[PDB]
Structure 1
């Protein structure tokens, strides 16, 4: 039952540079990973690059560079981007890696031996930009790169082309009943629920067999050869999906480089994924194809697929530019708070500033300053509380209930709802402080201040602990200001109210230090 918590992002295409969609997907992956480490579990978080296929090769042809140099360069830009964004991903995987290819061949061979791969033809539409097979119902009319009539995808609006090849075929049609059993037996396996319902409808309709090879010429020879048939290459998505299996089997050193590939996945206790984070654009591949391959191979199926609301891939939005302007943690807070499982979000500077000023500065920041202020907290310590009033007890109840509420939300996972829950408590704590007016209590009633101050400090600690996956740097600052011992900054034991004992001294002040500075 207890294993390493395995969380993954999709592996991104290297045809263009890093951008918001990749940053978001990896941010979600990172936060889930961070939450489970704070909870005290073992974690392996995976991200990477999808480097083979027609469109990557063509993207490299256009830049007058060999596919090897082009992919190695762009992968480097992705790695730099993720270091810059301050993630805590455990490993970065590239499909060009030899161990990955080893695993692909191994999986391919398994599927072939079970009788689930046969030689056939695909005659039909294809989107090179989505590397996706389409039926005629998923295309319509549109405009070429030059401007002529042509066909485009209803899915993405990218150009389609007709394909008539002799291909290796995966017997996907044979897995319809089993996939439907899987979805019905595990009704939390796809999130959010309306995307779960979408998948089920699709599979109910019926499943065609799936092309899993292309002729080597079509792919510009930039792909993995099919075992025992050099004229064919492995489909970029069988290749790409398999990264999760590869990553589950790689021992990794202290610096982050891969070292060794185990034979049996159970050695490392990662497979299958506990959470696959993906965009909505790639749901069919993760919820239909991937499990069908795993069923064919007799491999365990993933627990959860979370499909967020942005399609994974004169109006620029540069994450690193904005994080340099508003702060890293602040931008992360905004991206995770502004949207759930929909595109709609006012990603404007007006709204980024509204939430920076309203929530992060006025609600969280102001509250940290009030409970550490030398005017209010005169001894610079956690006081021992006196007797609790019924109003005190109501706030204490909220703080006690928060961990279990936030835990359920983080496990769904619905990170927006987990933030909202924490901030509801932060608002309540502010309301309580304005009622008790502890600044007045310093002169008039000191025994009472002890109680008010203790509750405020402990509320700030518990909320900050649950926000630490969202605001990893600022949570450390906050804990330093509160003087929270290092041991108390993680572990489910410290989700409990009263974990930091009275008499703990605060961290020292800096002359005019601000936590979140208000902009405009």
Structure 2
């Protein structure tokens, strides 16, 4: 039993935070939140990648010091994430002095294992991606000036030739072990088609990887190689090490770091159970990272999950403005509902309003009000049910199964599928409620209404619970309206049908609603 350790990528600070980072961190936040709902220990991690030529040259373009630049843009990332209302346990910065120490330790470990030698890298590089590319991954294109140039096929950013004496890591020696790893743990990369991609690439063969650069090239904005101050550590080896650092940091409740433990086992976080990443940074996490860890004699992460978006890029979205307009919880819902493992996503205002109105308001919202309405629930309490009809049983079955199903989806992790599963059950509850016409039963048959109302109430409680990682603020409101005690708002014990007893009283009236419909 360990601390469930989930991470987001750490984002370059060349520019202000935008939708892409918010999305990536959201996914990390949800996975964390679900596992806390199951009553597990969690450590969710996010932060900023502050070294390198890319970041240095952005600070240069704004005619400001790297220290001041990175610190300002970091504060912006932090402000954005506080504003987005996540439940992240720590925000790491690669400029952190304890992080630097961890990198040198890891470097020293790889060096002592014999896996680092002085060689040369002569070949193409994308500064914007901080990525080495072979000639098969470039093509002709254009720069900001409008001259003919070479560009990455990965991303379309400008590439440049590099010929440097660099320290090299023996990546080629780890090809077979990475392959054994991919096959022995077929869940280790998600979604499955990116697992195939990684195997195909490693199958083809692996060159050694440049893990240092000449200090002139990086404008001295990087961690020096231990025992060689002429060289700086590759920004990506620096960056990937944040996962290790984060796993070794004791943090106060204020969120500030206060100690770096010698040994990761001390905090029971490492290795990560899930690395959330974008599709643009797959090779670093599924090829380079496991190879460093194997060299270092460290344990590998359990899962890498690579979503359909980019970690970084240029339907314009200031996440905070859209949240101020449509709602924080609803914006998160929409991003998680609309985004599959691809770019097949419609983020138009039209479709956002359709989903807000269609699902959040009409399906979930309406259901809460019906089962809490003074009209239908005249006693304002959880009634004790009478005998169940077959129709009752069928809905009860769906509700009884929902947690196990949603659980598996959350553990893939495929949040979209989890959301869809909950809402399938919400549609079912509405259909039942339409059939039973409890408004009519209030007069006709109060005993039958007890049964119908209780099942409805319980369907709403369980669905809301399983949606609580997605709608953290609104789940609280729903629970308050239903009058569910705090103790029952968490824990797998409360995944069970019938956890909240008959006679529980509902919360007081607000009459403000849950999700107001936006005009079309």
Same fold flag (TM > 0.5)? yes
Instruction: Give per-residue Cα distances to partners, 1:44-65, cap 9 Å, x unaligned.
Output: 0000000000011000011010
Number of residues of Structure 1 aligned to a counterpart in Structure 2: 517
Post-superposition shift, 1:312? 1.1
Displacement after TM superposition at 1:87 (Å): 0.3
Q: Partner of 2:354: helix, strand, or coil?
A: helix
Structure 1 residue 132, shift from structure 2 partner: 0.1
Q: Structure 1 unaligned segments of length 5 or more: list them.
A: none
Q: Partner of 1:211 in structure 2?
A: 210
Residue 507 of structure 2: SS of its match in structure 1? Answer: coil
Deviation at 1:316, TM superposition (A): 2.3
TM-score (structure 1 length as normaliser): 0.99
Cα deviation for residue 388 of structure 1 reads 0.3
Moved more, 316-325 or 228-237: 316-325
* Cα deviation 1:405-443 (Å, max 9, x = unaligned): 000000000000000000000000000000000000000
Equivalence for 1:367: 367
C-alpha deviation, 1:149, in angstroms: 0.5
Residue equivalent to 2:125? 126
**Distance in 1 separating the partners of 2:401 and 2:57:** 55
Distance in 1 of aligned mates of 2:60 and 2:282 = 29
Deviations along 1:354-396, one digit per CA (max 9) or x if unpaired, are 0000000000000000000000000000000000000000000
CA distance in 2, matches of 1:268, 1:493: 27
Aligned-residue offset at 1:318: 1.1
Partner Cα distance (1:423, 1:448) in 2: 25
**What's the CA shift for 1:350?**
0.3
- The Cα RMSD (Å) is 0.4
Per-residue CA distance 1:321-358 (angstroms, 9 max, x = gap): 11000000000000000011001211000000000000
Partner secondary structure for residue 167 of structure 1? strand
Instruction: Determine the C-alpha separation between the residues in 2 that align with 1:183 and 1:132.
Output: 23
User: 1:462-505 deviations in whole A, cap 9, x for unaligned?
Assistant: 00000000000000000000000000000000000000000000
Distance 2:505 2:60 in 1: 63
- Report the Cα distance in structure 1 between the residues aligned to 2:475 and 2:419, rounded to whole angstroms: 14
1:144 and 1:399 map into 2 onto residues whose CA distance is 56
Distance (Å, rounded) in 2 between the aligned partners of 1:201 and 1:286:
16
Counterpart CA distance in 1 for 2:75 and 2:268 is 29
- Output the CA distance in 1 between the equivalents of 2:354 and 2:319: 18
Q: Which runs of 4+ in 1 moved over 3 A?
A: none
When normalised by structure 2's length, the TM-score is: 0.99
- Residue number in structure 2 paired with 1:293: 292
2:460 is paired with a residue whose SS is helix
> Equivalent residue of 2:43, what SS?
strand
The CA distance in 2 between the partners of 1:339 and 1:5, in whole Å, is 25
- Distance in 2, matches of 1:131 and 1:43, equals 31
* Separation of aligned partners in 1, 2:344 and 2:420: 17
For 1:147 and 1:137, the matched residues in 2 are separated by 23
Question: Equivalents in 1 of 2:299, 2:326: separation in Å?
Answer: 43
Shift of 1:145: 1.4
Paired with 1:166 and 1:254, the residues of 2 have a C-alpha distance of 45
Tell me the equivalent position of 1:39.
38
- The residue aligned with 1:324 is 324
Q: Distance in 1 between matches of 2:339 and 2:69?
A: 34
1:191 alignment partner in structure 2: 190
1:129 counterpart SS class: helix
SS at match of 1:219: coil
